Design a protein around this ligand. Structure first.
Ligand code: HEM
Ligand SMILES: C[C@]12CCC(=O)C=C1CC[C@@H]1[C@@H]2CC[C@]2(C)C(=O)CC[C@@H]12
Length: 452
């Protein structure tokens, strides 16, 4: 089979599609092209032929196999943000990615996952006691800021544990994400004119310098530690691996940064959407509250509770299915292969449109929010909110633990109200690297009213 998509109009075909991606944003452009052309089609970003695919069968093949364990993006963009062959997220060097990933995998499962449930709860408790930091005169809570601050505090106390300026680093992480999202698919021409990206360069430096202060302190505490194996964490694991010569200092520093930004970037927006959904679905709220009463009572949340929280689990799954944040996954072909019916040469970029896939393929009621979509056991080959296989979400299991832990401890204490008629559907969204609220708009606040 030949490949669907717009015509290569003697070099105008590539320029319109790239231009469309730059104007619309990656996400919306992906949804445009899948709607106009097939659910498996071809576009160009820069020179390279890039495939945009929403087919579940294609999705499954790509994530299953090792020869897709790469992403893509502007070399100049990735060098600017420090992700070019340095972290794991957009580390496209297969061998360097292979040797860096285990550090993330170990920290995000096993005992660290068990510690996280209680770390999350305590971190949210402490911030819910300090609601004055985040609440308006008219009682409006800045939930986005609240969630970002707990997510950072959570990540720090588990993976690094060095005291930091919580409020400042949060703003800096937001700055970093903007830079990341801005520069990721900009053409090489964009980087020639310097009064057009130096804005983002400063944002990257702001965060990287701030994290440097923290890693420097961490390095000192490690060198003067008696019981070194008694208090191991993610940052220490990397620093010792560097000392063995397995890792580069620059690489270590990017890993720590990537670990710290991950939850503030994705978890907080996800939980925000989840909280807006609770506010507008009172029947679903009741089920969750009754489940909390049955399973937990007024005991502290524990690791043994998380499996039992089935209703909430289904809620989290449905929220992610219906209103995703990470609705697209970027990959690259490392070997030639035939996929479904189409030829896919090595060096071909892939964008998997998982958001659209979750509205087309398996679910009974795809275009409405219902826990009925998860009333029967969902095959993981039709629902992929995290990705799977050798390059699936490193935090995929811990993320479920964290989301449960904070939803339990928040809803236990407060009823959530939305301002005016606002819902996830009415929120003005940016649909670029991720699907998130346009924060230049207002009416994003909530009202937290006590329970009992
Ligand atoms: C609701 C929250 C989250 C969602 C929806 C999410 C989703 C995803 C998805 C779809 C990917 C791409 C996987 C693929 O290519 O198949 C990814 C990658 C990744 N995630 Fe998450 N994730 C979440 C939370 C987290 C957390 C809490 C962490 C760690 C603190 C994390 C760390 C990572 C890392 C390091 C990668 C890059 C993996 C690699 O390229 O090897 N994620 N995530
Ligand atoms: C989950 C994630 C990493 C942790 C973080 O800090 C923020 C994000 C949001 C963008 C994700 C990314 C992982 C890689 C993804 C799936 C892509 O291939 C395109 C969009 C992108």
């Amino acid at each position: 089979s030949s490949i669907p998509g717009p015509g290569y109009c003697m070099g105008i075909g590539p320029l319109i599609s790239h231009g469309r991606f730059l104007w619309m944003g990656i996400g919306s452009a992906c949804n445009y092209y899948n709607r106009v052309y097939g659910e498996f089609m071809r576009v160009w970003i820069s020179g390279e032929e890039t495939l945009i695919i929403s087919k579940s069968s294609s999705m499954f093949h790509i994530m299953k196999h090792n020869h897709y364990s790469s992403r893509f993006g502007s070399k100049l963009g990735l060098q600017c943000i420090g992700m070019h062959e340095k972290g794991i997220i957009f580390n496209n060097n297969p061998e360097l990615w292979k040797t860096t990933r285990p550090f993330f995998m170990k920290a995000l499962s096993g005992p660290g996952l068990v510690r996280m449930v209680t770390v999350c709860a305590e971190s949210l408790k402490t911030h819910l006691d300090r609601l004055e930091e985040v609440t308006n005169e008219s009682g409006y809570v800045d939930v986005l800021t609240l969630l970002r601050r707990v997510m950072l505090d959570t990540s720090n106390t588990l993976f690094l544990r060095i005291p930091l300026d919580e409020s400042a680093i949060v703003v800096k992480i937001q700055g970093y994400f903007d830079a990341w999202q801005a520069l990721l698919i900009k053409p090489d021409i964009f980087f020639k004119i310097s009064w057009l990206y130096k804005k983002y360069e400063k944002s990257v430096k702001d965060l990287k310098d701030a994290i440097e202060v923290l890693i420097a302190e961490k390095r000192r505490r490690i060198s003067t530690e008696e019981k070194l194996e008694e208090c191991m964490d993610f940052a220490t694991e990397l620093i010792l691996a560097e000392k063995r010569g397995d890792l580069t200092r620059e690489n270590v520093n990017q890993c720590i940064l990537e670990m710290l930004i991950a939850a503030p970037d994705t978890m907080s927006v996800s939980l925000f959407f989840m909280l807006f959904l609770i506010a507008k679905h009172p029947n679903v709220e009741e089920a969750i509250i009754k489940e909390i009463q049955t399973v937990i009572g007024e005991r502290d949340i524990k690791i043994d509770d998380i499996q039992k929280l089935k209703v909430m689990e289904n809620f989290i799954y449905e929220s992610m299915r219906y209103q995703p944040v990470v609705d697209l996954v970027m990959r690259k072909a490392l070997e030639d292969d035939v996929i479904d019916g189409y030829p896919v040469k090595k060096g071909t970029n892939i964008i998997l449109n998982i958001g659209r896939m979750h509205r087309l393929e398996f679910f009974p009621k795809p275009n409405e929010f219902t826990l009925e979509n998860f009333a029967k056991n969902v095959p993981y080959r039709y629902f992929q909110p995290f990705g799977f296989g050798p390059r699936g979400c490193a935090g995929k299991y811990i993320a479920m633990v964290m989301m449960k832990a904070i939803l339990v401890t928040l809803l236990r204490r407060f009823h959530v109200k939305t301002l005016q008629g606002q819902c996830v559907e009415s929120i003005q969204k940016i649909h670029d690297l991720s699907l998130h609220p346009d924060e230049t708009k207002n009416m994003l606040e909530m009202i937290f009213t006590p329970r009992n």
